[PDB]
Amino acid sequence: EDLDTDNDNIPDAYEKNGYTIKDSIAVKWNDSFAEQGYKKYVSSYLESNTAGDPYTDYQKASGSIDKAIKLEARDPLVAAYPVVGVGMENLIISAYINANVRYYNTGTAPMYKVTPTTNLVLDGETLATIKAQDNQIGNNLSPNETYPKKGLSPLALNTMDNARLIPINYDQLKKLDSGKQIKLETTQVSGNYGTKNSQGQIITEGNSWSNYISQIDSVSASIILDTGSQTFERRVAAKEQGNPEDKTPEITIGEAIKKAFSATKNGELLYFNGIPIDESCVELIFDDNTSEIIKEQLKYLDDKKIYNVKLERGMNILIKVPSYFTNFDEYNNFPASWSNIDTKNQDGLQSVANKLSGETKIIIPMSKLKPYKRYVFSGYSKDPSTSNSITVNIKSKEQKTDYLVPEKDYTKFSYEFETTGKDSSDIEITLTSSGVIFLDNLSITELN
């Protein structure tokens, strides 16, 4: 019907079910609209700002907002949340200290009039707090862009009060003599956002992000997709547990990721920029509460998959893309081939598996490895016999010798090791199979 309660130019029955914006008006969603590119949106029929961002449901869905905002935030659930963090490009150092900084942005919305805050800490003790004065105020910061932009020298940082920074008493300098870098972390960032007024001009002076930070961060779940070379932070709204009046739609984790990161789902797989980010080909990291929630919710779920559980308010997810991944079907970035591998199989995770008769050993050079970094190998093993014992030997700073008991179906195993020293002993990784085993989706991922 045409009854409207929240007063956001979208009918209630259209909000509860699917709806799309056609020629600046909302129409009932029809499945035949998928081919043309029309996207189906659903949102609560009792609130205008569903995700908490300043733009309402009609403004976000109809594209009537600032053009710098990515298409990911045009979904009423994804919040236009700019994430800004100061990076320390170089250090210059009684003694006067200078630093080179360059702000980074990863959210779905730009931040105007950037004004960050920094902490000068070396070990626990913080020397001083710096609010960037009028010299370092970055006027514009588009998503996935830096201030200054690529191809420009980072701007200096000497303004503390026009007093300059200085470590005094020589005790901090004495501690630094042994070697302790001065960390630069961003406590907070102050910025504005764009709203078109009655006269049509974009006004970005009276606005402020700080009013909506405590609201966006309280009615949404953070989902981060890290590919190593770049990071993307998105927040997806979700309903409360014991609230009988919260009409925020419920979405699965996979659907939340697809909505947030604008992933092209081709049949069954999920792709971000041509790289698969589906459940079986990426290592996910959750905090303790999310891990407990998922563990509790898997038993009640028949399919028993991570990407089929509903999202909940307060969730935290990190999607760590593997550094090196192979599947024996369409991708193998490993510089060195594996040992005793047979592709003549049909019982794999998607198409084929690895038929091993004996043991598999892999040798990796140190050219493509980062010293003082932790790497984790993972894969899926299938053994219908359930009678073969498999052990793995890992050569590293600390020698590891562990055994595994594969099940009838595919099971994911995680083995953690740390490599220290670029010019160290060659890493030896060997796994032994009692009989014939099936392997698929072997991945190498760099961690903290």
Added chain:
Amino acid sequence: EDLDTDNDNIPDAYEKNGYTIKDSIAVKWNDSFAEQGYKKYVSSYLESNTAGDPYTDYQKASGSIDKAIKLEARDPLVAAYPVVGVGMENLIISTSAYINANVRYYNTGTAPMYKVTPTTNLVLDGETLATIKAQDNQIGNNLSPNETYPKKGLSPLALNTMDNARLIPINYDQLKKLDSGKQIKLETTQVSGNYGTKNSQGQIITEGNSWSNYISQIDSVSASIILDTGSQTFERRVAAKEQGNPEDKTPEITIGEAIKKAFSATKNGELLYFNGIPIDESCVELIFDDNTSEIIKEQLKYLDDKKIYNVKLERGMNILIKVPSYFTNFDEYNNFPASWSNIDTKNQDGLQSVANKLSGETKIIIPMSKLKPYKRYVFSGYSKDPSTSNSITVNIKSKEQKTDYLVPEKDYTKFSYEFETTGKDSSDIEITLTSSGVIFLDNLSITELN
């Protein structure tokens, strides 16, 4: 009807009785609505701000306020009021002598306080060295309730400015005082902050909405209730009607109902659980001031049940709830590292399921290395003696040896014993009690005090 005397979008007939918000329209409360998850809201029918907070009754009940405000303040009787404090995480002194400190603001209220500007006092022993207000660099943009600034995982910020010259204290006297062994303390006085109100356009504005306007109003028409689970401290303000004024129509509720409303704790029939932990009458120790203690003493003798959680709440009461660290009830919880002596679980006269049957004396050997020194602890429990012919004395070892007697009554009685524990390399703590005959015990606990 539709008579709206105070004009808060809720009819007075539904304000006097129970009302609930459904589709942003107030509806009459029904007993069947409880199963679907709805809650019954009651508020006065002569004013818009029943609890004195900047948001009205309809805004609080219908959730038309900032989403960072806890559901604990969605009740019209529970005010939205942030309690911001400052914690001196570290001290740095440099060579007259320049003093620097690391602070980290803490919020334990219900509503966020944007743009926090704390004012702090630098006191060493009685004499106050200086009074400092937060500068342009020590201001936190967002302080969500039950959070800090900087958030968890970041170093504390510095406070090395007096106005923008550094701190300039005295030269010799303060150093001589410090070298004696005293410690610089920090005592916050007042904090400045704002709150959001969705204007006509739809943009939340938090510039002129100072929290300081609604502090003297909130603290005057509310009964302060404070919780302390040891780690996570909670403080709340609950509205209470005036005593001798008939024109004040604020609803009156019991202390237990006030606690359940303020802290949103689940109640499974009769027992009350906060997060699965018991904070009911016998499961926690209540602390009052003089006025509340006298009022409760006068009111209790008029109550047949003799229950603290059934005393009508009044304006200005101060109630502190301190959850004991060590709690054993012989039913589902026993956190004491050392097993007790002469304890029997075969009973049916307990407060909830069973009690403790003692034949002789009860002795416990509690390790002290697991107990922090330089603190004060209170031993509490309930004793029941139908015979009323047993003399009980307690043997407690501490810094000063103490021994007290007890005369149990027919029913269960709560007894409190006070002692001081100091010194890490000190004598082990021993607690022993002797019973003349067979006695019934329940809910034995050890609680930390000031």
Added chain:
Amino acid sequence: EDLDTDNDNIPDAYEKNGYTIKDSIAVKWNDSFAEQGYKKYVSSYLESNTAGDPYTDYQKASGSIDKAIKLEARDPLVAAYPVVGVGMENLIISTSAYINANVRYYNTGTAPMYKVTPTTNLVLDGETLATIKAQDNQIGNNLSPNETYPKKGLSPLALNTMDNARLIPINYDQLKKLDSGKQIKLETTQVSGNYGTKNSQGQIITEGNSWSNYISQIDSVSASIILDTGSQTFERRVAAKEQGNPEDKTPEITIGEAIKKAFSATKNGELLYFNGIPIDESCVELIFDDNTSEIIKEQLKYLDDKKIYNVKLERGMNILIKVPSYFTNFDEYNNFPASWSNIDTKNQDGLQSVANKLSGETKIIIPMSKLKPYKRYVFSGYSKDPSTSNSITVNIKSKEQKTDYLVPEKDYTKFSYEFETTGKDSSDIEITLTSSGVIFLDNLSITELNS
């Protein structure tokens, strides 16, 4: 009727007589409303701000103002006036040189002052040395009535800036005068603040407001009344009418009713219980100024009741009340550690229940542990002698020995024996009064007399 001349939502026919507020609408007063707890107010029907405070009569009567405003000020005849002072708690001087001051503001009025900002002189001996206005570090966001800043439980704030800068005893005279029995006392010339009014959007705004506008109006239509119990101090202002104006329709009330309205004291027939401590005329020693004393002396001869709590309150009167430190009416209170000698309670013609049937003289010794050194005390009581044949003389031993004589009247008469005590370890005070025959004495009072 509905004749609302003053445009304050209360009819004139209701304002001239009594009116009570029920269900946010003013209704006429009937005596049956007393037992339910309602109160009757009277106000001038040509003015909205009858008392001079920024809140109108309807708002104050209905309680539609800031909730921190005291219940004592909901009466339209009592003005909401935050009397904010600054107290000296600790003084530090150490190197011209430097001297540090710790202060703690006090509020005693019926209204809270927001964003307080005092302006204090630091005098040495008559001569002024400096004038320090509070900076951004010395501003109290909230100062609720009967509550200080910093609130009780926290140490007082410092005072180390006249402009920023450091506060200095500039010349050597202030360096040498410290130890010669002198003072660095602090007195507040003025204080600043705001008040909270709700705008059309329901929000309380305290920015554009200021108490400085409503001071010369509140002080010029009122009658200052101060109460001093020796620990807590209250100051109130009660509206009154100008004598030479035929259009000031402000209702006229007596001093006793003014006290009852201002301090919310309860009157259960004959007892005026402020907070359980009686503040009746006989049970306290009043202290007036010159003008009020002359006014009462002139008016009393035209009144047959012969009481101070009956004289009509007039604009500009100043009244100070000092609750007696040591009082005993032989009925329900006696704070004297030692019982008085030669006491006979077998009587019924006392002021309230019984009197004292003295036969001879009376003597008692007051312990020195409860006397303020270097202070002037006052001993007073009522004396009745129907016989009118016994002369009363007293012998007092103190720092200076004094003898006083009294001439009793037919009915009760109040005597005063003003004396001075100095020194903690001084000579014991000898209290001795001699009566030739049988005399009646009542209400022995001991009130410290202000300088």
